[PDB]
Write a protein that binds this ligand. Structure first.
Ligand SMILES: [Zn+2]
Length: 215
């Protein structure tokens, strides 16, 4: 009821589903949105904000400024790991199979994910064409491929190692214009996730950052 789809886990902490990453909503759009941010707690307070480096602006981020000016990477590894920028991704997807919530099947939602899954998408296209490997754009409605989402609790964390892409396949009914029109219709504007309004001014961030660090 918000537009975002999530994999629902069981008591054991297991989850599986089949999703289909969708292509760019428009010709000048991208199938993925890249977002960077910071998230850490200090003095009983949380600093959870987007990082202006998402669009190459490190100056407008107080954390990056702090990390850099204090050479934390070299003077305090620990602190560095806690405060370092974190990259995630957004995409539009078509839920194929969702055992835990069958009502999602056949619908389009925005889906967020990390490097572990992003690499699987890229490993499909960044192949060795010198050895004859066939690249595959998994987001193509005709020659893309469904992705099986598998989660398992490993060492207390959600592990996605078993997630993988299946064989290439065209989306069913994709040739039907009405279906195709509705599919792209339900896709949300991914650039919206990285627009200017998603970043607070430097002064506001710095103010919050300082209260979190106690300055
Ligand atoms: Zn930053």
């Amino acid at each position: 009821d918000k537009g975002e789809w999530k994999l629902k886990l069981d008591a054991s902490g297991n989850g599986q589903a089949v999703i289909r990453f969708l292509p760019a909503k428009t010709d000048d759009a991208l199938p993925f949105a890249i977002l960077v941010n910071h998230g850490f707690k200090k003095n009983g307070k949380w600093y959870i904000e987007t990082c202006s480096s998402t669009h190459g602006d490190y100056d407008s981020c107080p954390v990056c400024q702090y990390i850099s000016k204090n050479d934390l990477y070299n003077t305090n590894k620990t602190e560095y790991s806690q405060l370092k920028r974190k990259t995630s991704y957004w995409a539009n997807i078509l839920v194929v199979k969702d055992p835990q919530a069958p009502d999602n099947e056949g619908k389009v939602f925005k889906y967020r994910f990390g490097k572990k899954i992003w690499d699987k998408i890229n490993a499909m296209i960044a192949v060795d064409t010198e050895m004859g490997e066939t690249p595959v754009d998994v987001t193509c409605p005709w020659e893309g491929a469904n992705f099986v989402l598998k989660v398992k609790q490993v060492s207390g964390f959600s592990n996605y190692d078993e997630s993988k892409f299946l064989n290439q396949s065209a989306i069913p009914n994709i040739d039907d214009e009405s279906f195709q029109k509705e599919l792209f219709e339900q896709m949300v504007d991914l650039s919206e996730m990285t627009s200017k309004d998603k970043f607070k001014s430097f002064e506001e961030l710095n103010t919050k950052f300082n209260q979190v660090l106690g300055t």
